Design a protein around this ligand. Structure first.
Ligand SMILES: CN(CCOc1ccc(C[C@@H]2SC(=O)NC2=O)cc1)c1ccccn1
Ligand SMILES: CC1=C(/C=C/C(C)=C\C=C\C(C)=C\C(=O)O)C(C)(C)CCC1
Lengths: 269, 19, 216, 9
């Protein structure tokens, strides 16, 4: 139809804006994970010894001392999130129509969307053995993460299990760009004031995603529906992590949350 | 209110990320 | 292309809930719980009528229903409540209004049902065929632990996707985004389903409550 | 239990 060329132009705009906002693409992460690159430097962390050797090799850089390992790691993930929220915010602001939304609604969409996107993009950095860290400069094993003391040894496991199944869809960065846009423009977030303009933008993005998938994965049947079904798993990943945090805050001395994450998580589910 | 409970996101959305 | 006919799914849906439940002339939780138990029995009846469900290993049939009854029931009562004002309509004919849901300490989840499920189904005029397909999608969940053949369950799920898609194309050709909008009701249903299961774990735990008990 | 019975019917 005559909607098709604007839907491809939209896909392309989103991809270009994705490349602008997210330093480590899936394409780059895969090159690293499969060893393809030649600037292939990843320091591998698989036990306490290698963690000590590699920790300084791993942004906002200083040294608050004496915390145990599990906590320093859990909190490293937190600071990665802080950075991710900023990249995602920039990306969101490139989606046509987004910055024209009520600013309350922009906040709400980011508040409830950032973690679903974070776990989506974390998949791009994962294989069944571990995850890339500090933009590809390190690699931390799944077994190492799982060996941490309760309750920190199981916080990653639902994310690896999601990633294994997500990565089986074989999406590329062009696909991801549109899917992430779809997640941000979610009209079911609590407390939205103006649902209709959000859903109108989302409908257009969803048309763009279906066309992208059909063209880019011409032999993958019902790829579109299977991808949209992943938004259900993502919602559960997030709500289960929120709950884990609630235990932790009621039972772990005083790990304080970064203020950006304090604001995100305050009154979230 | 909402934006008041989200000062940082509000600034990021309107101004961008400071260096 | 109807290795999963939408006519059958609509049949399976129409096999529950008639006009005679006018009324029979509060404790919302026991009322809701009583409706749940009742509808659990008709759920097996529903499932039997969903194409190829019965053709599955029996232990599989057991786990699919064990895993999804929760969401399967919430989906049904929510769609039934499309015309009601600030409440839901149980399968026993009773209303539960929000104030008694707040009075019973379950206001928060209850309001989510109203905003993220009922109100959304109302605004898009979700039809019963659509509702039945979504329930079938929830039914055929191949990540449920213990499945002998998950790829067969995935296959069935994917047939609902193609058949529901074909249906929305034919029935609603002026709404090319309709099929996606349907699938996008599922994340809220999952979240609500999880919170509801915790509340029941709690009510079971304190003794606030038969088939339902088994399911828990 | 019930579920099993109800299926086989
Ligand atoms: C395992 N890696 C890779 C990143 O892995 C992540 C896992 C979870 C999140 C979500 C964070 S953690 C939290 O409680 N809230 C959040 O937003 C974000 C990133 C790292 C990275 C840096 C240091 C240590 N390890
Ligand atoms: C309402 C309600 C809840 C319902 C839970 C479940 C598990 C099933 C309801 C089934 C019905 C309502 C079937 C029908 O009407 O046909 C819970 C306890 C979470 C919290 C209180 C609000």
């Amino acid at each position: 139809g005559p909607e098709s060329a604007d839907l491809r132009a939209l896909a392309k705009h989103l991809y270009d804006s994705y490349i602008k906002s997210f330093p480590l693409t899936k394409a780059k992460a895969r090159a690293i994970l499969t060893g393809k690159t030649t600037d292939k430097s990843p320091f591998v962390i698989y036990d306490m010894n290698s963690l000590m050797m590699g920790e300084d090799k791993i942004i906002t850089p200083l040294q608050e001392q004496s915390k145990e390992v599990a906590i320093r790691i859990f909190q490293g993930c937190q600071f990665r999130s802080v950075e991710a929220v900023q990249e995602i915010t920039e990306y969101a602001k490139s989606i046509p129509g987004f910055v024209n939304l009520d600013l309350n609604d922009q906040v709400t969409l980011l508040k409830y969307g950032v973690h679903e996107i974070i776990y989506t993009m974390l998949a791009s950095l994962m294989n069944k053995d571990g995850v890339l860290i500090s933009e590809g400069q390190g690699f931390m094993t799944r077994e190492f993460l799982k060996s941490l003391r309760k309750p920190f040894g199981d916080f990653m496991e639902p994310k690896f299990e999601f990633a294994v199944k997500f990565n089986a869809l074989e999406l590329d960065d062009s696909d991801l760009a549109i899917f992430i846009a779809v997640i941000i423009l979610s009209g079911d977030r609590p407390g939205l004031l103006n649902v209709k303009p959000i859903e109108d933008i989302q409908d257009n993005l969803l048309q763009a995603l279906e066309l992208q998938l059909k063209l880019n994965h011409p032999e993958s049947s019902q790829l579109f529906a299977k991808l949209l079904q992943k938004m259900t798993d993502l919602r559960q990943i997030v709500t289960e992590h929120v709950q884990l945090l609630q235990v932790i805050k009621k039972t772990e001395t005083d790990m304080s949350l970064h203020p950006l994450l304090q604001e995100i998580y305050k009154d979230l589910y | 209110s909402l934006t008041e409970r989200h000062k940082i996101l509000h600034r990021l959305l309107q101004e961008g990320s400071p260096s | 292309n109807e290795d999963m006919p939408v006519e059958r799914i609509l049949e399976a849906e129409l096999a529950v809930e008639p006009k005679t439940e006018t009324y029979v002339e509060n404790d919302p939780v026991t009322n809701i719980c009583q409706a749940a138990d009742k509808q659990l029995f008709t759920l097996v009846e529903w499932a039997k009528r969903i194409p190829h469900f019965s053709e599955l290993p029996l232990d599989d049939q057991v786990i699919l229903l064990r895993a999804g009854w929760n969401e399967l029931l919430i989906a049904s009562f929510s769609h039934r409540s499309i015309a009601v004002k600030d409440g839901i309509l149980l399968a026993t004919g009773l209303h539960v209004h929000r104030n008694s849901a707040h009075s019973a300490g379950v206001g928060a989840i209850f309001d989510r049902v109203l905003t993220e499920l009922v109100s959304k189904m109302r605004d898009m005029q979700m039809d019963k065929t659509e509702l039945g397909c979504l329930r079938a999608i929830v039914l055929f969940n191949p990540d449920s632990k213990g499945l002998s053949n998950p790829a067969e369950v995935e296959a069935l799920r994917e047939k609902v996707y193609a058949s529901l898609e074909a249906y929305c194309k034919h029935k609603y050709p002026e709404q090319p985004g309709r099929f996606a909008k349907l699938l996008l009701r599922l994340p809220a249903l999952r979240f609500i389903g999880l919170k509801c299961l915790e509340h029941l774990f709690f009510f079971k735990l304190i003794g606030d409550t038969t088939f339902l008990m088994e399911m828990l």
